[PDB]
Design a protein around this ligand. Sequence first.
Ligand code: IBK
Lengths: 167, 170
Amino acid sequence: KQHAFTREDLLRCSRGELFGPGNAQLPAPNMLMIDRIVHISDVGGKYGKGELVAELDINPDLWFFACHFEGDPVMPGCLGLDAMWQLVGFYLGWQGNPGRGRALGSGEVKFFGQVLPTAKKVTYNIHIKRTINLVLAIADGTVSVDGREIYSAEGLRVGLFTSTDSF
Amino acid sequence: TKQHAFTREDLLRCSRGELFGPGNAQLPAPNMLMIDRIVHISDVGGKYGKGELVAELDINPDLWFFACHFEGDPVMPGCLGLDAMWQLVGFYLGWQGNPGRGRALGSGEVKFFGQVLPTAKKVTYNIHIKRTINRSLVLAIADGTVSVDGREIYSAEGLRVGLFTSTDSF
Ligand SMILES: CC(C)CNC(=O)COCc1cc(-c2cccs2)on1
């Protein structure tokens, strides 16, 4: 029903309190790689099967700049990638499906730019390609920094797992 | 290229730029460093006859990510096991004696089909080098798998990492 979420909405999700116990949670800091969801719907997008647009605000004091790497700070790609998985999981829970979320993998992933600590904002664009009903979603995603496209991922997969679902 | 294993302190020295020198490959420091030790690294043998790395990360409930991922449902993030494999392929490139800073370039298929719970003992990475290209930029292509206490849980085909004597373009 709701098409945008604030950081507090996301934190409430991370405690299990948005979609309920046993259903999809975002991670909490410092794994949470999203500050807000600017748009989420289940129509339109590249494939007509939905879209998310999310943001993460950047400043030099974010933890990962210190350790990755000393004398050469850059946001880790894996974390931008996980953002995209986090977002596809959120989608599944937001649609009203039950169960806990797990990334199942992707096809191609490409990194061709970087998020430096002089950046202002990272934006994720996720396009849902298919939902299969175990319940799972396939999407493409890109990551951008102050307007500039830097990562891409094809065929991101996230599944949801109930009481009766095992890895 | 002489040394075929590294301790955690070797890896921490690498992370400060002090194993391979300034401007060459570094591992990340904690809490992004996802390896405790490299048990075997060589540039012959492996699946493809072009080299192999075997590395370990020790698991205990205390590791930071278990608290936040997720509350009431701790599990190691897959992205971090993935990054371990990139981190390792970068180390290989520096260990071969090439210059420049490392950047993950991407991969083909990745599959997650198991998980690391905080009751696990040890995660093990096995990386097989498929190709190193030295033609203009220096880069590596490898397959990898991740295992937890003997059980294979992730796979990655076509991991790519490059070295850059000049990243300024990105
Ligand atoms: C898909 C093929 C073209 C790979 N792409 C390239 O050749 C372009 O350069 C790679 C690059 C990567 C990064 C980052 C890596 C990790 C965090 S940021 O910053 N520049």
